[PDB]
Amino acid sequence: AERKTTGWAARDPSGILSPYTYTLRETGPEDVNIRIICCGICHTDLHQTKNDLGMSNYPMVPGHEVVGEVVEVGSDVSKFTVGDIVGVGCLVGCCGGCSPCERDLEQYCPKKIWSYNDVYINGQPTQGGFAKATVVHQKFVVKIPEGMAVEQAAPLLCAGVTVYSPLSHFGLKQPGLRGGILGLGGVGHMGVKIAKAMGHHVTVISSSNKKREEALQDLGADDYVIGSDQAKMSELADSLDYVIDTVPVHHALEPYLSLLKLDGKLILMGVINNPLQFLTPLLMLGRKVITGSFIGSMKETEEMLEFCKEKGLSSIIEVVKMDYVNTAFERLEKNDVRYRFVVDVEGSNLDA
Amino acid sequence: AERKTTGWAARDPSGILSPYTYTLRETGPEDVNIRIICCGICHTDLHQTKNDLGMSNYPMVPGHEVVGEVVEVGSDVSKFTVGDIVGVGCLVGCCGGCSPCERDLEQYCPKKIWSYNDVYINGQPTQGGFAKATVVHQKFVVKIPEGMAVEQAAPLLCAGVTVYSPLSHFGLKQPGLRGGILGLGGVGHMGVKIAKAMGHHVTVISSSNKKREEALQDLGADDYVIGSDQAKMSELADSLDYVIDTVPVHHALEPYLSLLKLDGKLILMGVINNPLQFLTPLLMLGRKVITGSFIGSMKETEEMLEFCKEKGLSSIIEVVKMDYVNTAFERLEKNDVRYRFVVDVEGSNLDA
Ligand SMILES: [Zn+2]
Ligand SMILES: [Zn+2]
Numbered sequence: 001a002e003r004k005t006t007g008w009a010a011r012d013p014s015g016i017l018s019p020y021t022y023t024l025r026e027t028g029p030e031d032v033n034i035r036i037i038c039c040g041i042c043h044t045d046l047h048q049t050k051n052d053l054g055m056s057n058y059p060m061v062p063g064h065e066v067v068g069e070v071v072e073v074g075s076d077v078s079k080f081t082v083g084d085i086v087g088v089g090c091l092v093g094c095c096g097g098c099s100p101c102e103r104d105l106e107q108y109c110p111k112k113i114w115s116y117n118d119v120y121i122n123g124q125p126t127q128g129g130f131a132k133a134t135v136v137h138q139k140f141v142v143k144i145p146e147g148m149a150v151e152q153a154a155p156l157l158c159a160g161v162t163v164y165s166p167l168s169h170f171g172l173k174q175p176g177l178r179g180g181i182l183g184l185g186g187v188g189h190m191g192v193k194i195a196k197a198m199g200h201h202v203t204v205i206s207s208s209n210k211k212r213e214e215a216l217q218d219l220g221a222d223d224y225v226i227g228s229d230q231a232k233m234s235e236l237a238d239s240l241d242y243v244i245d246t247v248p249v250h251h252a253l254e255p256y257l258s259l260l261k262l263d264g265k266l267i268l269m270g271v272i273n274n275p276l277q278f279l280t281p282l283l284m285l286g287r288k289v290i291t292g293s294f295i296g297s298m299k300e301t302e303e304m305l306e307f308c309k310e311k312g313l314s315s316i317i318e319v320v321k322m323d324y325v326n327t328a329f330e331r332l333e334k335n336d337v338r339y340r341f342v343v344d345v346e347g348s349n350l351d352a
Numbered sequence: 353a354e355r356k357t358t359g360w361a362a363r364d365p366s367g368i369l370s371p372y373t374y375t376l377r378e379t380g381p382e383d384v385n386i387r388i389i390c391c392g393i394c395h396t397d398l399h400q401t402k403n404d405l406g407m408s409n410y411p412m413v414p415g416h417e418v419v420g421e422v423v424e425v426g427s428d429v430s431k432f433t434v435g436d437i438v439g440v441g442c443l444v445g446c447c448g449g450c451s452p453c454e455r456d457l458e459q460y461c462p463k464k465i466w467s468y469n470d471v472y473i474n475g476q477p478t479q480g481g482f483a484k485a486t487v488v489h490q491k492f493v494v495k496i497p498e499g500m501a502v503e504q505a506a507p508l509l510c511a512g513v514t515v516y517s518p519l520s521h522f523g524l525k526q527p528g529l530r531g532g533i534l535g536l537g538g539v540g541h542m543g544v545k546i547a548k549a550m551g552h553h554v555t556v557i558s559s560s561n562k563k564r565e566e567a568l569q570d571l572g573a574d575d576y577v578i579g580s581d582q583a584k585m586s587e588l589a590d591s592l593d594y595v596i597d598t599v600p601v602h603h604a605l606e607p608y609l610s611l612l613k614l615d616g617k618l619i620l621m622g623v624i625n626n627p628l629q630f631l632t633p634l635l636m637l638g639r640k641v642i643t644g645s646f647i648g649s650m651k652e653t654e655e656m657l658e659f660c661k662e663k664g665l666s667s668i669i670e671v672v673k674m675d676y677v678n679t680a681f682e683r684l685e686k687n688d689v690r691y692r693f694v695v696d697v698e699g700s701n702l703d704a
């Protein structure tokens with residue numbers, strides 16, 4: 001293609017990252033060429049890296065929470081002008097001609113191409129944002145809002161829209177609503193920020209008192225309930241408009257469906273690889289919903305970023321240099337990060 | 353109270369009906385006193401009768417698809433004028449002061465009182481529509497539309513709104529939609545009528561070729577698929593906007609979720625007493641909904657009846673006299689009815 005980049009790749013299920021040089025494509029008519037400033041780390045990167053889901057193709061450059069600079073723009077693009085600080089999410093392509101793609105629900109396209117570990121329309125293995133540059137179709141790039149900081153808008157490109165997409169789709173953008181956040185991972189954490197920011201009563205549900213300081217002090221949730229403290233669990237019995245169910249492992253749905261009121265939704269966003277249960281007469285009891293959501297579209301990623309700027313959301317990111325990415329992976333695995341990690345990619349890896 | 357009626361009650365789990373005389377209440381300020389013309393039979397009546405659900409209180413007069421005449425009206429009622437042919441559904445009371453009752457979603461009230469087998473606000477056991485009369489709170493009575501026949505509007509009071517309530521709530525009243533009707537019971541049968549009448553492509557799904565003539569000839573569904581004929585089951589793989597899941601026993605949800613397109617709903621309306629399964633990454637795949645619905649409110653029962661008159665729906669009812677109710681129960685059990693049963697209650701049971 002048109003020139004080379006170096007970035008840090010994984011090349012076996014041990015997931016240890018070391019520099020890897022590769023060729024980027026020629027900036028085609030619709031493409032946008034980006035000089036990556038920083039890239040965020042989150043568990044997807046930890047999962048594909050070490051294989052885990054049994055489907056990793058190596059060499060693999062992670063990073064899907066990308067924010068950089070348009071240095072070059074394809075023959076047709078006009079949204080972006082060179083110089084613009086832009087950002088790239090989990091996807092880099094879709095078929096553009098099926099009903100999800102026309103509806104601007106391209107994350108739901110059957111033929112979506114992922115940031116890395118996939119293969120693009122030209123036959124090339126997609127590589128992440130842990131590199132000094134990337135070329136991305138203009139449809140999968142977003143202008144990061146003006147006051148917004150780069151390492152700030154990078155968690156927001158992944159966990160931001162995963163929460164804001166349902167909160168916007170299920171009509172839950174309304175002030176007043178009562179929500180539960182079951183699970184305090186990354187998506188959970190953002191749940192308590194975007195929900196609380198939309199004007200919602202946010203109750204964080206867990207299983208131990210470890211996330212009390214986090215949910216109540218650092219997240220500002222209105223009270224914390226242990227999913228096993230039956231006293232307070234029953235006072236909640238028909239008060240919640242929705243539940244953002246974030247737990248990745250198998251759990252009983254019925255205790256959480258129980259907190260829900262008439263027409264209440266349980267939005268599931270952790271992948272439980274084993275079939276979850278529900279007792280059918282209780283969904284009938286409250287015209288309750290069991291649903292799910294896969295990330296966000298690009299229209300919603302604009303919306304969400306704009307929203308967090310307006311409402312001034314601020315996650316507590318920890319910015320590390322690229323030689324630290326392996327210990328940063330060890331710690332993100334042992335949950336030793338003070339909430340999020342952002343790799344400063346202008347803390348470079350020059351390897352021609 | 354104020355006078356006696358005779359009707360036919362069940363008095364043990366054998367469910368055999370024989371005349372039973374009892375006292376109706378005094379028409380209180382909000383109450384409406386009705387002279388029952390005809391009453392429909394459906395499986396609820398067959399279930400409570402023979403106990404089945406382990407909770408029947410005897411003596412028990414069935415019938416919850418009631419249409420009769422207001423002979424007397426309480427001190428405050430003004431909707432109804434004596435002479436009006438009215439109808440009564442599954443419920444006869446609710447708390448009137450909780451959020452479902454204010455929202456006009458009274459069927460979802462925690463404190464709803466059922467037609468029979470329950471106990472009313474005055475302490476009296478509620479008794480059905482298999483009697484020559486009943487007194488009902490004005491809130492649980494509906495004016496049967498003008499051209500509409502009495503034995504016609506009686507199936508419609510139960511199976512009508514059970515279908516029309518979700519079809520109206522989930523925004524599925526729109527022409528064009530593709531729906532599946534999984535299960536051809538009573539609710540299923542009405543599904544294929546109200547869906548087809550709203551301007552939908554109706555595909556009836558089953559497990560054998562017995563309901564072909566019924567679904568295609570007598571119901572006018574657009575094609576029939578055996579849920580096990582994998583060839584045609586896979587050509588349907590992302591075409592349906594919704595599924596009215598009507599099967600009362602445990603079944604795999606995932607084959608039926610598979611027919612659904614982006615944002616497709618599976619509306620469950622048969623009570624599976626054992627927890628149904630779903631693989632969580634596929635709901636995430638299509639932002640698919642698993643939901644349920646318990647009958648309809650009274651506003652929706654007006655709407656629905658008015659709708660079936662406008663669209664001229666006509667179920668094939670079989671009108672029997674009250675001495676036939678036991679053989680009619682035997683046959684409704686062996687599914688020997690040419691679709692619905694209606695007991696002519698002006699084919700009387702005088703027993704003082
Ligand atoms: Zn991420
Ligand atoms: Zn597409």
Ligand SMILES: [Zn+2]
Nearest residue numbers: 394396417510
């Ligand atoms: Zn019925």
Ligand SMILES: [Zn+2]
Nearest residue numbers: 447450453461
């Ligand atoms: Zn109520």
